[PDB]
Motif scaffolding. Structure first.
Motif, mmCIF file in Angstrom:
data_model
loop_
_atom_site.group_PDB
_atom_site.id
_atom_site.type_symbol
_atom_site.label_atom_id
_atom_site.label_comp_id
_atom_site.label_asym_id
_atom_site.label_seq_id
_atom_site.Cartn_x
_atom_site.Cartn_y
_atom_site.Cartn_z
ATOM 1 N N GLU A 1 -4.193 6.882 9.282
ATOM 2 C CA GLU A 1 -3.571 6.698 7.967
ATOM 3 C C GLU A 1 -4.539 7.027 6.827
ATOM 4 N N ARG A 2 -4.948 8.302 6.775
ATOM 5 C CA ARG A 2 -5.908 8.742 5.767
ATOM 6 C C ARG A 2 -5.571 10.105 5.166
ATOM 7 N N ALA A 3 -4.354 10.622 5.352
ATOM 8 C CA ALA A 3 -4.088 12.027 5.057
ATOM 9 C C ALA A 3 -3.107 12.268 3.915
ATOM 10 N N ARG A 4 -1.861 11.808 4.009
ATOM 11 C CA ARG A 4 -0.821 12.269 3.092
ATOM 12 C C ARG A 4 -0.690 11.393 1.852
ATOM 13 N N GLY A 5 -0.724 10.075 2.000
ATOM 14 C CA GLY A 5 -0.615 9.216 0.838
ATOM 15 C C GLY A 5 -1.956 8.867 0.231
ATOM 16 N N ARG A 6 -3.022 9.456 0.760
ATOM 17 C CA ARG A 6 -4.383 9.086 0.388
ATOM 18 C C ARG A 6 -5.184 10.232 -0.208
ATOM 19 N N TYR B 1 4.562 1.715 3.160
ATOM 20 C CA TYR B 1 3.777 0.777 3.950
ATOM 21 C C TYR B 1 2.681 1.414 4.784
ATOM 22 N N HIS B 2 2.735 2.716 5.045
ATOM 23 C CA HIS B 2 1.744 3.399 5.877
ATOM 24 C C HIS B 2 1.286 4.688 5.204
ATOM 25 N N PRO B 3 0.542 4.592 4.096
ATOM 26 C CA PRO B 3 0.168 5.809 3.364
ATOM 27 C C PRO B 3 -0.933 6.573 4.087
ATOM 28 N N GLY B 4 -0.685 7.854 4.328
ATOM 29 C CA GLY B 4 -1.650 8.684 5.010
ATOM 30 C C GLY B 4 -1.360 8.977 6.462
ATOM 31 N N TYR B 5 -0.199 8.565 6.972
ATOM 32 C CA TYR B 5 0.082 8.611 8.401
ATOM 33 C C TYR B 5 0.253 10.028 8.942
ATOM 34 N N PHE B 6 0.748 10.959 8.133
ATOM 35 C CA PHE B 6 0.994 12.331 8.560
ATOM 36 C C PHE B 6 -0.088 13.248 8.006
ATOM 37 N N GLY B 7 -0.670 14.078 8.866
ATOM 38 C CA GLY B 7 -1.605 15.099 8.439
ATOM 39 C C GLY B 7 -2.918 15.028 9.188
ATOM 40 N N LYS B 8 -3.769 16.015 8.910
ATOM 41 C CA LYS B 8 -5.076 16.166 9.534
ATOM 42 C C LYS B 8 -6.187 16.023 8.501
ATOM 43 N N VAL B 9 -7.157 15.167 8.811
ATOM 44 C CA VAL B 9 -8.339 14.985 7.971
ATOM 45 C C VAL B 9 -9.572 15.067 8.861
ATOM 46 N N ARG C 1 11.334 7.610 5.885
ATOM 47 C CA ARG C 1 10.271 8.126 5.029
ATOM 48 C C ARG C 1 9.866 7.132 3.948
ATOM 49 N N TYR D 1 -0.315 13.802 -1.988
ATOM 50 C CA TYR D 1 -0.424 13.043 -3.225
ATOM 51 C C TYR D 1 -1.390 11.885 -3.006
ATOM 52 N N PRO E 1 0.832 -1.208 0.000
ATOM 53 C CA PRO E 1 0.000 0.000 0.000
ATOM 54 C C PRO E 1 0.863 1.252 0.000
ATOM 55 N N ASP F 1 6.122 5.691 3.752
ATOM 56 C CA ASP F 1 5.300 5.932 2.576
ATOM 57 C C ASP F 1 5.006 4.677 1.773
#
Ligand SMILES: [Mg+2]
Ligand SMILES: [Mg+2]
Ligand SMILES: [Mg+2]
Ligand SMILES: [Mg+2]
Ligand SMILES: [Mg+2]
Ligand SMILES: [Mg+2]
Ligand SMILES: [Mg+2]
Ligand SMILES: [Mg+2]
Ligand SMILES: [Mg+2]
Ligand SMILES: [Mg+2]
Ligand SMILES: [Mg+2]
Ligand SMILES: [Mg+2]
Ligand SMILES: [Mg+2]
Ligand SMILES: [Mg+2]
Ligand SMILES: [Mg+2]
Ligand SMILES: [Mg+2]
Ligand SMILES: [Mg+2]
Ligand SMILES: [Mg+2]
Ligand SMILES: [Mg+2]
Ligand SMILES: [Mg+2]
Ligand SMILES: [Mg+2]
Ligand SMILES: [Mg+2]
Ligand SMILES: [Mg+2]
Ligand SMILES: [Mg+2]
Ligand SMILES: [Mg+2]
Ligand SMILES: [Mg+2]
Ligand SMILES: [Mg+2]
Ligand SMILES: [Mg+2]
Ligand SMILES: [Mg+2]
Ligand SMILES: [Mg+2]
Ligand SMILES: [Mg+2]
Lengths: 187, 53, 147, 128, 53, 148, 124, 53
Positions: free
Chosen positions: A174-179, C47-55, C41, A185, A155, C45
């Motif tokens: 895990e819903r923010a940067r790679g998603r 293996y853990h997509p989406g780990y950094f940031g606010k949603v 990094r 992106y 993934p 990226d």
RNA sequence: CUAAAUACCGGCACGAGACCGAUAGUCAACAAGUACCGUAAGGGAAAGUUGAAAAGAACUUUGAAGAGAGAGUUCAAGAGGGCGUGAAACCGUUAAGAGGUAAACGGGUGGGGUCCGCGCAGUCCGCCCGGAGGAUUCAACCCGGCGGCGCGGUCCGGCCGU
RNA sequence: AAUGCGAGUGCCUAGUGGGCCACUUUUGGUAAGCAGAACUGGCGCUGCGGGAUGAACCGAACGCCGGGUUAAGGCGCCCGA
RNA sequence: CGCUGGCAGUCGGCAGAGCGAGAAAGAGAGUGGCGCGGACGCUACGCCGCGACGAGUAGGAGGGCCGCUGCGGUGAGCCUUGAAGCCUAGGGCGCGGGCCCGGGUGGAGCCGCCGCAG
């Protein structure tokens, strides 16, 4: 000397069951005798499947058994299962079935015997059809386990629907940067 | 705080009780435990209820 | 069983399975989740997509009990009542339809996924989905709402 | 009046010396018992010419004559008189050694029973 | 198997009395020494007392 | 050994020094023997050379096992469908390159020959340079008698 | 069954000795005294035992009757053979072959009976 | 196996993986014995290769 | 204002252990927070075992004595007051062998020793033949007991059946 | 088309991430047992026969042995010929 | 290592002794024209037979009837007619880890097998 490569000289495959249970180890003796003393390839497949691990003999649902024995041509045959025949409760009608399995669950056994079929063990199958004639070999869905959703391409890679390993699922897991196309992106 | 204790499933505990009880009514299995039972009249050795008294 | 472990077979081998060149040092890449932005990094990226940031929106005093709504599909609708409830309506001739209370069995919303056997039902539920009520009306049945 | 075995084949041993440990001669702290050298520069594990040999699998004895005494028998350790009726049907290939902790009074009775059971004893005149 | 014999109840003098009890079906359960060993060696750790320096 | 040359030496089934094999000749074979030219010594065998080689060093590949050709049934059980049922049929199909030459040659194990008695001339150079490598046309039999 | 309880007793029996790269059995009815499925004297329904007599001379032959299998008190029948070295060798062979009683142990019974008679001779 | 335990809540005797366990009587049965090939019990050791030349 | 369920490596009194066994286990099994060190705050050891019982070696003799030699105790002083067992490093002496390329080593033999084979007339086993003997002895019949098998085609009676 | 070979596939995964040398091609430098590349083979990780000696050269890669024959090298004596 | 090879057929006076042979398949059933005898085997986690192969640092895996200490079982185990320990120009076994006997010393406890634990 010779310039051969000894990397793949030892094939990994199972010669015997890793389990020490003596009721399985007697059926292994029986079908080991049968596989080398008959020319039927059914005994070879049954003997090889008796060696296998628990994940390599996944359970069958009763509904999958009904659909795989409802096919044309294969009437009045013995469905042979190496794993476990479990009950499937989202089906209402059960026809009569002649069953050979290592294990049958208690509520599936009641439904099969109330339908009017027979449930055999593998020594009974060896006595009835020594060469396994009039039988339909069945096996459970091997990719049915949850472990196979995390397998494949990683993934966080374009066009990869692989389930990641999360401690929990939710809004901020895990819903923010790679998603998101907004944050960074999206693959 | 080492894990001294283990928990076993109740169905497996009962299964082991059944397997230990069914093996006690067989000749060779109690001989191979070493018990001197060559003159015992029956292997499910059942006596009368005045023994409790 | 420490006798089955790898350590008992590593007595006599100098580096203890850890290498002569790159030794088993203490923390050669940081402690824990260190360097998720910087030098781990690629792993983070790949293996853990989406780990950094606010949603999304925050909800301060969220209690899980308000949004409690357990679901049951229609392929499990007939497992909530007994078997002699189902077969008596099959042998029945007056057209009376048994009542399935899913709130008694512990479900609030009925979704419609599987088939239904061709016999009438009266399903009492707190919520219904559209395909769930149409599969009950198509087999011939009532969708009673309860509070 | 010696007790002959069933057969007495010629025993071939590929090596009769012991496999001594490297540098067990320059030190008393280094015992004779074999330890495989695992140093980076060790001239013994690199199999340099004229050094101490290593116990490979090729030195293994023939399976027909393995664990067999020079009298042609194989050995069984015996603690009491009851362990000889074990060996009476294996008479012409296995012999008895009375254990060291057995007293002389019982050791007399063991060899007395072995004489009439025709079982050979490797130490019949042991303690007395 | 399925054949359950008729065990005889013995008196306190060693001879057989007139009472017969059918063999319970527990004695025809499968014999699994691996499961008996697994249950025994895991339940035998539960009576242990802690030790520490 | 160079990798391209290792691949051709394995497709010729010459995996060990002093191994020998029978190869039928065409453009696709000469262009491979040119690649493995400094590492081999090949030539044109005599009929007596084929007789000596098949009778003394003839081993069959039967069930992926190197089995000595001690009876005609061993040949006839595997090559009997190509009407090759004895030593003489095998020698005929090898010497006269026939229709089933591929099957008859692949049935034979590669020939495990000894060191040459008398001695080699020079291993590192070509035969026309007074050495050993390359094509010795009629003179492979002189090596065959001293090596067999 | 015999196979079923052999799978229990093949490694964790109290009659088993494993030392000096050999294995045996101190079982009462194990003739040849070795640990095997064929020669095991308690797992089978029909067993043959050959033992010395209580006094100095004679060979006791023991069989197991088919009726009382869970009844070990009356399970084994015992006969005493105080005869010459040849008619006992004919007698045990008759008891096995003519009765068809576990027939793959006949030469083992004869070889045990010869050894008992040799052991009961005066020593030199 | 047909009546559940009355003093336990919901316990049954476990099921047998193999009903007839006497595989000797299973194997030398006429049902199995007719559907077998002939036994190849002849030992074929290696042949010393004499030179035919 | 208010009991109970809750906490407890201090104290008193107890019980137990798949723990350790005198370089271990508390620092401390013993005149141990002692001896000793530092102005001080503080730091902080080492150290168990004669024998069953002192029966702990009277007396004679040499020496100034420590030390010996006899004698005696004890099952044993090869247990003699830091004494159970008494290893290795190191040393003394006896015996054997050797010695100018420091010693040591691997492979291959040879020589000399130390012990062992309790070696020094050389294996028994089965059948048959021949010759000298001796038994309370073989086969076959009778009686009694026990066991095996029985498609007793299907004998009478029981028991069980996932 | 020839030749040869049983393949395909999925998990988990240590160590490594200082390299060095040689034929040929090749950059900087007067040059270097210098610095930097390409290809292949080695050494590192590997003993053995030869080059007297010897990481890399020539031959050849290794279970314990007996007989025979060789490679690269040699055959006055050391020292087999 | 491979042949995912072979052996439950030890089928015996309720007997007939075999599956190596170049050529898919049955030493098949029926229907009409004296002497009481025969080695070993098979711990199937066992035994047996054919071939091919064997370098190794870092590293990985498997097998240990290799070794130490303690626990549950088990050897009608060993022992003051001598245990543990220690010494030994003694006899041996195992490729090896190591182990078993003989002599001496010593004076009170110790070990084998099946599992468990560090
Ligand atoms: Mg090799
Ligand atoms: Mg390798
Ligand atoms: Mg590999
Ligand atoms: Mg290593
Ligand atoms: Mg290090
Ligand atoms: Mg590692
Ligand atoms: Mg690292
Ligand atoms: Mg770490
Ligand atoms: Mg940065
Ligand atoms: Mg190095
Ligand atoms: Mg010559
Ligand atoms: Mg070159
Ligand atoms: Mg208050
Ligand atoms: Mg308590
Ligand atoms: Mg202390
Ligand atoms: Mg001490
Ligand atoms: Mg002391
Ligand atoms: Mg003493
Ligand atoms: Mg003392
Ligand atoms: Mg004492
Ligand atoms: Mg002392
Ligand atoms: Mg001297
Ligand atoms: Mg580094
Ligand atoms: Mg450079
Ligand atoms: Mg390499
Ligand atoms: Mg090299
Ligand atoms: Mg030079
Ligand atoms: Mg040679
Ligand atoms: Mg020279
Ligand atoms: Mg290797
Ligand atoms: Mg010494």
């Amino acid at each position: 000397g010779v310039d051969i490569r000894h990397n793949k000289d030892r094939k990994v495959r199972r010669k015997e069951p890793k389990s020490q249970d003596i009721y399985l180890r007697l059926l292994v003796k029986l079908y080991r005798f049968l596989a080398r003393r008959t020319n039927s390839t059914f005994n070879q497949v049954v003997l090889k499947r008796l060696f296998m691990s628990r994940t390599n003999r996944p359970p069958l649902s009763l509904s999958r058994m009904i659909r795989k024995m409802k096919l044309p041509g294969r009437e009045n045959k013995t469905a042979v299962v190496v794993g476990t025949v479990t009950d499937d409760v989202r089906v209402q009608e059960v026809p009569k079935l002649k069953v050979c399995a290592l294990r049958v669950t208690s509520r599936a056994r009641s439904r099969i015997l109330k339908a009017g079929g027979k449930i055999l063990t593998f020594d009974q199958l060896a006595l009835d059809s020594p060469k396994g004639r009039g039988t339909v070999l069945l096996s459970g869905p091997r990719k049915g386990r949850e472990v196979y959703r995390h397998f494949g391409k990683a993934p966080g890679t374009p066009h990869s629907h692989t389930k990641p390993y999360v401690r929990s699922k939710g809004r901020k897991f895990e819903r923010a940067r790679g998603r998101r196309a907004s944050r960074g992106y999206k693959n | 705080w080492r894990r001294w204790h283990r928990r076993v499933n109740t169905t497996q505990k009962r299964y082991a009780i059944c397997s230990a009880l069914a093996a006690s009514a067989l000749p060779a299995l109690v001989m191979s435990k070493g018990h001197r039972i060559e003159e015992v009249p029956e292997l499910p050795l059942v006596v009368e209820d005045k023994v409790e008294g | 069983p420490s006798r089955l472990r790898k350590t008992r077979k590593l007595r006599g081998h100098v580096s203890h399975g850890h290498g002569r060149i790159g030794k088993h040092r203490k923390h050669p890449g940081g402690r824990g989740n260190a360097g998720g932005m910087h030098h781990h990094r690629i792993n983070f990226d790949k293996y853990h997509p989406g780990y950094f940031g606010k949603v999304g929106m925050r909800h301060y005093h969220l209690k899980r009990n308000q949004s409690f709504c357990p679901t049951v599909n229609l392929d499990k609708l007939w497992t909530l009542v007994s078997e002699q409830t189902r077969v008596n309506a099959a042998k029945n001739k007056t057209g009376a339809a048994p009542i399935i209370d899913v709130v008694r069995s512990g479900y609030y919303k009925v979704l419609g996924k599987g088939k239904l056997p061709k016999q009438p039902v009266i399903v009492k539920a707190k919520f219904f989905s559209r395909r769930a009520e149409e599969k009950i009306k198509g087999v011939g049945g009532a969708c009673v709402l309860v509070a | 009046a010696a007790l002959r075995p069933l057969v007495k084949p010629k025993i071939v041993k590929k090596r009769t010396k012991k496999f001594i440990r490297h540098q067990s001669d320059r030190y008393v702290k280094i015992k004779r018992n074999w330890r495989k050298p695992r140093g980076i520069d060790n001239r013994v594990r690199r199999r340099f010419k004229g050094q101490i040999l290593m116990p490979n699998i090729g030195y293994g004895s023939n399976k027909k004559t393995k664990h067999m005494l020079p009298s042609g028998f194989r050995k069984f350790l015996v603690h009491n008189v009851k362990e000889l009726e074990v060996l009476l049907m294996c008479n012409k290939s296995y012999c008895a050694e009375i254990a060291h902790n057995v007293s002389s009074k019982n050791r007399k009775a063991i060899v007395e029973r072995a004489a009439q059971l025709a079982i050979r004893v490797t130490n019949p005149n042991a303690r007395l | 198997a399925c054949a359950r014999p008729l065990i005889s109840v013995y008196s306190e003098k060693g001879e057989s009395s007139g009472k017969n009890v059918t063999l319970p079906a527990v004695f025809k359960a499968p014999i699994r020494p691996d499961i008996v060993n697994f249950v025994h060696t895991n339940l035998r750790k539960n009576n242990r007392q802690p030790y520490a320096v | 050994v160079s990798p391209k040359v290792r691949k051709v030496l394995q497709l010729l089934r010459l995996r060990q020094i002093f191994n020998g094999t029978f190869v039928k000749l065409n453009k696709a074979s000469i262009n491979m023997l040119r690649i493995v030219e400094p590492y081999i010594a090949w030539g044109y065998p005599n009929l007596k050379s084929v007789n000596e080689l098949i009778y003394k060093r003839g081993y069959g590949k039967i069930n992926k096992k190197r089995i000595a050709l001690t009876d005609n049934t061993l040949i006839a059980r595997s090559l009997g469908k190509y009407n090759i049922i004895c030593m003489e049929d095998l020698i005929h199909e090898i010497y006269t390159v026939g229709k089933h030459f591929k099957e008859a040659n692949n049935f034979l194990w590669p020939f495990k020959l000894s060191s040459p008695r008398g001695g080699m001339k020079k291993k590192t150079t070509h035969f026309v340079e007074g050495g050993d490598a390359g094509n010795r046309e009629d003179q492979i039999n002189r090596l065959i008698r001293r090596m067999n | 069954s015999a196979h079923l309880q052999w799978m229990v007793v093949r490694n964790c029996s109290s009659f088993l000795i494993k030392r000096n790269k050999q294995t045996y059995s101190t079982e009462p009815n194990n003739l040849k005294a070795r640990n095997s499925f064929r020669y095991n004297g308690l797992i089978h329904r029909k067993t043959v035992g050959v033992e010395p007599a209580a006094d100095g001379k004679g060979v006791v032959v023991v069989m197991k009757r088919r009726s009382g299998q869970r009844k070990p008190a009356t399970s084994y029948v015992r006969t005493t053979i105080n005869k010459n070295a040849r008619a006992t060798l004919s007698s045990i062979r008759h008891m096995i072959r003519k009765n068809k009683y576990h027939p793959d142990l006949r030469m083992a019974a004869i070889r045990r009976a010869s050894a008992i008679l040799r052991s009961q001779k005066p020593v030199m | 196996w047909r009546k559940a335990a009355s003093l336990k809540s919901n316990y049954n005797l476990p099921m047998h993986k193999m009903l007839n366990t006497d595989l000797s009587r299973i194997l030398k049965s006429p049902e199995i014995q007719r559907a077998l090939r002939a036994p190849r019990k002849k030992i074929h050791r290696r042949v010393l290769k004499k030179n035919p030349l």
